[PDB]
Amino acid sequence: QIPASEQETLVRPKPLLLKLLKSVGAQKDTYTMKEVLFYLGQYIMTKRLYDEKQQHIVYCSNDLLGDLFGVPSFSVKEHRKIYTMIYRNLVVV
Ligand SMILES: CC[C@@H](CS(=O)(=O)C(C)(C)C)N1C(=O)[C@@H](CC(=O)O)O[C@H](c2cccc(Cl)c2)[C@H]1c1ccc(Cl)cc1
Hints:
Elements: E1 10-13, H1 15-21, E2 31-32, H2 33-46, E3 57-59, H3 64-69, E4 73-75, H4 79-87, E5 90-92
Antiparallel strand pairs: 1-2, 1-5, 3-4
The structure holds the ligand CC[C@@H](CS(=O)(=O)C(C)(C)C)N1C(=O)[C@@H](CC(=O)O)O[C@H](c2cccc(Cl)c2)[C@H]1c1ccc(Cl)cc1.
Subcellular location: Nucleus, Nucleoplasm; Cytoplasm; Nucleus, Nucleolus; Nucleus
Organism: Homo sapiens
Family: Belongs to the MDM2/MDM4 family.
């Protein structure tokens, strides 16, 4: 469904997303989606919003991430929905 070429595309995070990304990676004017996905994923793991003991679901209602995605939780395996939530928070270059 999701082509690997999508990860090479260039995007610019809006202010709130950039704030989250900055807590795990260096600030950049333009990121590749691969970068956005890793930093977002790393943020989730270091803050333990995703416990591999809790069946693929990320709980973020007590985190800025929840404000960013507009949901209290989501599955790490439903990638299509994740992409859609992320794009609400960035502008394509
Ligand atoms: C927090 C879970 C995170 C850790 S990671 O693989 O990024 C890691 C930081 C370990 C490299 N993570 C995963 O564990 C796995 C889950 C799986 O096997 O499907 O891949 C996720 C993923 C990669 C690329 C695109 C998407 Cl939409 C999701 C990805 C992910 C990235 C970003 C969001 Cl918002 C949600 C999920």
